[PDB]
Design a protein around this ligand. Sequence first.
Ligand SMILES: CCn1c2ccc(C[NH2+]C)cc2c2ccc(Br)cc21
Ligand SMILES: [Zn+2]
Length: 196
Amino acid sequence: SVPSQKTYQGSYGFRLGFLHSGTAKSVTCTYSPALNKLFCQLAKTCPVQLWVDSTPPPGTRVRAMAIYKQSQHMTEVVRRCPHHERCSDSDGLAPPQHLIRVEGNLRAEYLDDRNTFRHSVVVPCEPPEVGSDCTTIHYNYMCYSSCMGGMNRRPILTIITLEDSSGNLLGRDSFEVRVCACPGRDRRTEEENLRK
Ligand SMILES: CCn1c2ccc(C[NH2+]C)cc2c2ccc(Br)cc21
Ligand SMILES: [Zn+2]
């Protein structure tokens, strides 16, 4: 099977937001609206904003999962490559096989689906800090898109789902991800390719 990637704002008007980080060679994470694609360095902080029009119930959660973008690979579980799953860089909570981690949230839970074997990481949905207009989750991607025997240059999507306390769908958004050495350069290149 294959998880849905259909954008769905749902009853609470759920959607993502991204910072405007630019494309300098020194940037570590940058988002392209034209490509709906996040470019980031290995294991660096990726801020993702969560926006709603109305307050979801207590117990609402936010889940992140990666799938391959190309149809011929969508049934393959996205996981870390044979090197990175053994490099002993765990944070104490994320299983070493998981591509996506949440940084700095002790309530993050990591799921290995008993049926699909797919990995995901889920956190409680929290209201914005006083003075802020949205909530931000900090994600890390723990393999390069190019890693041999893992993603192996295949593009991936991250699916973010807003869930009730049972895991039922309340909202869904998604974005493509490239984990690479030079996100600013690669964003500029792919945006130019798109224009051309
Ligand atoms: C999904 C995170 N998020 C928000 C994001 C934006 C806004 C609107 N601010 C102007 C309100 C909320 C909000 C309110 C309650 C809870 Br629980 C989570 C919330
Ligand atoms: Zn790797």
